[PDB]
Amino acid sequence: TITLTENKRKSMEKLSVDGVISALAFDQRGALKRMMAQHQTKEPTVEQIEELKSLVSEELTPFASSILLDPEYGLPASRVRSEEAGLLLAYEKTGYDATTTSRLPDCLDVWSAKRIKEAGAEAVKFLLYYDIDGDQDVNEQKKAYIERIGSECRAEDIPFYLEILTYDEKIADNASPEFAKVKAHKVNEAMKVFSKERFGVDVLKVEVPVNMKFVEGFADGEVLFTKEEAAQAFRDQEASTDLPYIYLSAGVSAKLFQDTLVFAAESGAKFNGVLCGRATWAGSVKVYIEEGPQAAREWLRTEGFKNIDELNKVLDKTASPWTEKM
Amino acid sequence: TLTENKRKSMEKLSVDGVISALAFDQRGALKRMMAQHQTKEPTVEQIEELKSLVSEELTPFASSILLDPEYGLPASRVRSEEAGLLLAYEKTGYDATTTSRLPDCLDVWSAKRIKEAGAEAVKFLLYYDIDGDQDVNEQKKAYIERIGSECRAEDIPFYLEILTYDEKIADNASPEFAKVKAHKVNEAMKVFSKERFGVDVLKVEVPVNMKFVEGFADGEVLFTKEEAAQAFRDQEASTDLPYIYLSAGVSAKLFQDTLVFAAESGAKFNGVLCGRATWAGSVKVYIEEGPQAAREWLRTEGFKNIDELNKVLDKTASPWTEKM
Numbered sequence A: 001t002i003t004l005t006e007n008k009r010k011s012m013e014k015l016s017v018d019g020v021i022s023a024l025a026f027d028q029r030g031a032l033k034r035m036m037a038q039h040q041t042k043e044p045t046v047e048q049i050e051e052l053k054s055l056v057s058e059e060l061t062p063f064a065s066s067i068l069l070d071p072e073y074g075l076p077a078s079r080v081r082s083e084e085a086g087l088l089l090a091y092e093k094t095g096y097d098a099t100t101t102s103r104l105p106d107c108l109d110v111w112s113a114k115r116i117k118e119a120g121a122e123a124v125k126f127l128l129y130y131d132i133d134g135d136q137d138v139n140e141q142k143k144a145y146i147e148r149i150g151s152e153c154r155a156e157d158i159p160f161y162l163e164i165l166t167y168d169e170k171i172a173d174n175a176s177p178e179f180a181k182v183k184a185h186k187v188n189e190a191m192k193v194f195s196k197e198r199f200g201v202d203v204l205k206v207e208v209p210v211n212m213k214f215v216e217g218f219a220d221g222e223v224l225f226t227k228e229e230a231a232q233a234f235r236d237q238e239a240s241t242d243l244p245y246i247y248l249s250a251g252v253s254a255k256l257f258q259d260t261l262v263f264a265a266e267s268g269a270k271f272n273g274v275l276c277g278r279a280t281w282a283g284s285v286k287v288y289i290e291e292g293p294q295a296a297r298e299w300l301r302t303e304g305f306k307n308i309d310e311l312n313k314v315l316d317k318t319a320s321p322w323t324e325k326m
Numbered sequence B: 001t002l003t004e005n006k007r008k009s010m011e012k013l014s015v016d017g018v019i020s021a022l023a024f025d026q027r028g029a030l031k032r033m034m035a036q037h038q039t040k041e042p043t044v045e046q047i048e049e050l051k052s053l054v055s056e057e058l059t060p061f062a063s064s065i066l067l068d069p070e071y072g073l074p075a076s077r078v079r080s081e082e083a084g085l086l087l088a089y090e091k092t093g094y095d096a097t098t099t100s101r102l103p104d105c106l107d108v109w110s111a112k113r114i115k116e117a118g119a120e121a122v123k124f125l126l127y128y129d130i131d132g133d134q135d136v137n138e139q140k141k142a143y144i145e146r147i148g149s150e151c152r153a154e155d156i157p158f159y160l161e162i163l164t165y166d167e168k169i170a171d172n173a174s175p176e177f178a179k180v181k182a183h184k185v186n187e188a189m190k191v192f193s194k195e196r197f198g199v200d201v202l203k204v205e206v207p208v209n210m211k212f213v214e215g216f217a218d219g220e221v222l223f224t225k226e227e228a229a230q231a232f233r234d235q236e237a238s239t240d241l242p243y244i245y246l247s248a249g250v251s252a253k254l255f256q257d258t259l260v261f262a263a264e265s266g267a268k269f270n271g272v273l274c275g276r277a278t279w280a281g282s283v284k285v286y287i288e289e290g291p292q293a294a295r296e297w298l299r300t301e302g303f304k305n306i307d308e309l310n311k312v313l314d315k316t317a318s319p320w321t322e323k324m
Ligand SMILES: O=P(O)(O)OC[C@@H](O)[C@@H](O)[C@H](O)[C@H](O)COP(=O)(O)O
Pocket: B023, B024, B025, B026, B027, B028, B029, B030, B091, B092, B093, B125, B161, B246, B247, B248, B249, B273, B274, B275, B276, B277
């Protein structure tokens, strides 16, 4: 897969530093209330969620290549980001119907790729839940949906970042040993599908192809995999796309994520960055409520910075430039 | 633009800049017509067959045919060599329990897939009340932006059909709706002529209910001929895009007389996408007498309908190759 228009390339560059994506993300649009819900008794507010987002944006984007935000609540935050940091806006509705197994994708009702571009984004991000082994008609609908979005992004000449989260229709918990044994299959086969030209993806945002918590040396409990087997999953992942791809952090600590990046590189993965945030800013939330907005600012300038700086130093030794895939 | 490929497709759908197209993407509407002439529920085979019969028999006389991907792909493959293809992209009908009538693409289709199925155009039907809920219309506008963008990327003409309604008026055949129809139609056209929606051709209602116009009415008269004519001129002043009329199932003769009246009034419309005014009578014949009787109906009454329409189009429609 080898194409970038002049504008898509300029946008990718705005999202990167020396071909590496070190992008700052937020978690959901409801998750933040709960981290706040620890105290007071209020749910406060639309006014305040937009604020902490603006504090995290303003203080930490100077050290990130870009920031990913939600349009429904993140636009104020997007306007206070560093001038040297690019912007991705999410296009999907969050969550899924737990009562069914289909997890069908659905774009935000009053958004379009055109509107995302008009709001100043350098990329459209869309999250798809995909079970390669799932219902074939469900997956046809999902493929059709991504084709439309890839087409929109082609027309608006804006990079398409497709996030894939894998699951199994018949496995309740994706942290389970049961899901771990098939994760490589789910992750890598999904990448093969959505690497096809017809879906118009510019960058894949994906899980590491193994639950490192069950790998020898990284596991606290039961061991399902040797380091050699885990490494093979990373090489298989590298072989599953020619597109740039970046890793999301899921279910692991900042330290284990960083150890995973080192292990990915060692194994032969040519990942081109990461898109994580929660670990980087999560601590600012309590401080925000125990000492106020100015103190959260202080947290971000010191602890927040230390977090993202640590990560960047790791990225500097492990990530590969996406320019090498062009 | 038109881009090279969009222009080539528009040419395949047209003759000398005029779209003389046959519409048969009916699904829910076709079901209700067949439901009048039998107690049994219409099957898949009967819907596919009637569509193929109309396609095979009448597309020699049309510049193109509009079919639906659900039942119409076999019909699409037996169309005349000289006729282009449009495929419908929207799910049929709307929710009668609410007033929003929100649009929804067919679940396993995309503009890319429509192009791959051999269409020279994507057709999408939007129900629109210009005076309706502001948030509903915002959602509608965003949806059309997405389709227009898909069609730009796949480099395939976007035909947007607009059917108007009023959230608080149950029956769009009523005098009450007639009195506001010109507003509904012409202001909707003006919105969806905005560049951001990527429309190449508007498929629209005539901006008057001609059954209430002086000289055409058989009962109550709501409008003089001069008032009706002015509604056509306002329609022409609402867009510089190519636009074509749908027949809305009036008689072949009223539709024909309406086109004459439109041209006389100053409407520079670029053709039609006409279905029921042409083949409506074939449904009962197919159900009650079977496919052979339907062919013969199509070869006589159907031909007669479409032939008389084409003659009227020849002396009323304006070429879109002026609007480019
Ligand atoms: O509700 P359904 O089953 O989806 O049918 C609607 C569809 O047929 C219309 O959009 C016609 O294409 C259009 O009005 C031109 O057809 P005529 O009005 O000229 O017959």
